[PDB]
């Protein structure tokens, strides 16, 4: 039976499987009555998700928009409304993301004086 | 020591703790070599898959950091190339970060999940 609780609790639970993603899928199709609601919990809390968890929600996206095209349009409309927003906001986490590992690395060779000042500038200027 | 020994353990380099620690022990056992470790280092980085070259700055990190109390000839080998390094990493990074998202778009756009007319204001929403 769907309800709000419920659909938080499995977004939650998502993992970056396509197992996760399709399950998942599966019961927001057969709730497909409830697709405005449904994809404005799915906004929501993909914008606090953590970082590295965010992607996963574009591809239950993608799985949940697919799949319901042979049962109606609800779901295809109802996403289009939040998918700039998401596509920016995942886009923007991303920029900031794939270097972050490589950023904090030289953090700690700045900190531990691993190399000079001068250098360590150079390295991060390297990456821009 | 040997360049063949190294270019193998540098193919079996993973991301464990245990994985980086141990090469970079040969590593400075062998720091008479430094020279030729930084230079097959370097070309072996380079010819890495995208998602394995931050453990190779891994391995660099441990051996310039466990090199300091033995002597500054990996310092100052590591020194030269690092510049070149980092930014071929990060060059890396910034070309693979969004495929994901791209992928999704390019999808949509060819199985007419969307039109062009939202793919395009997806696609700007990458920039945003």
Redesign the interface.
Same mark, same amino acid.
């Given at each position: 039976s769907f309800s709000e609780s419920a659909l938080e609790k499995k977004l939650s639970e998502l993992s970056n499987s396509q197992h996760s993603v399709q399950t998942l899928s599966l019961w927001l199709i057969h709730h497909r009555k409830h697709a405005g609601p449904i994809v404005s919990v799915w906004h929501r809390e993909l914008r606090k998700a953590k970082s590295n968890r965010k &992607?996963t929600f574009?591809?239950l996206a993608?799985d949940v928009?697919?799949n319901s095209?042979r049962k109606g349009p609800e779901f295809?409309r109802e996403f /289009?409304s939040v998918?700039? #927003?998401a $596509?920016?906001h995942? +886009?923007?986490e +991303? #920029?900031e993301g794939?270097?972050k590992?490589?950023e904090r &690395?030289?953090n700690?060779?700045q900190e531990?004086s691993?190399?000079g000042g001068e $250098?360590i500038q150079?390295?991060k200027l390297?990456? /821009?």
């Open positions: &992607l574009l591809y993608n928009i697919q095209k295809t /289009e998918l700039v #927003d $596509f920016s995942v +886009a923007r +991303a #920029d794939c270097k590992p490589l &690395l030289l700690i060779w531990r691993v190399y $250098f150079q390295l390297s990456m /821009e």
